[PDB]
Amino acid sequence: GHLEWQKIAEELGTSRSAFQCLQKFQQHNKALKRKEWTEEEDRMLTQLVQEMRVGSHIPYRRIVYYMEGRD
DNA sequence: CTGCCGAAGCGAGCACTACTGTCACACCTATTTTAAGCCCTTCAATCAAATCATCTTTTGGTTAGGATA
Structure with a gap:
């Protein structure tokens, strides 16, 4: 489930963290x-x-802080 | 016509801040020579703080990669 990444890394077998x-x-x-x-x-x-726009700015x-999955 | 002596207030002895004449010995420096420590200047050799040049990381915004609504 894309979770418990220590076990994922251990099972990968390439000594990753x-x-x-x-x-x-x-x-x-x-x-x-x-x-x-x-x-x-x-x-x-x-x-x-x-809420926060002024004119063209x-x-x-x-805004990336509020919604997840951007840069 | 001149002259003596009292009443009261004064007094004493005991209680189981600096000058001035001298005078010779003090002060004063002419030079010799070391062996380790020296103060201050004085510039030159060296280093590090500060600045400028330019590359890079993230916002604004566009190109056109990429997309919803």
Whole structure:
């Protein structure tokens, strides 16, 4: 279940650590680095944008704090 | 016509802050030579703090890779 990464690393058999395995997985994870979108992400993104936008300026990469799975 | 002696208030002895004449011995430096320690200048050799140049990491934003709604 993408979980208990110490056991994943031990079972992988290449002497990796849990943190290395997790880092490699997340950098190549479809579920994290989305190409699609979801309803709650769009709704909350619009909410933060409308709250904090002034004219043509918006917090592009700071909204990443609230929704999961972006840079 | 001049002259003596009392009443009261004064008094004493005991209680199982610096000058000045001298005077010779003190002070004073002419030079010799070491063996380890010296103060201050004075610039030159060396180092590290500060600055500037440029590459890189993340926001704004676009291109066109990539996408929803």
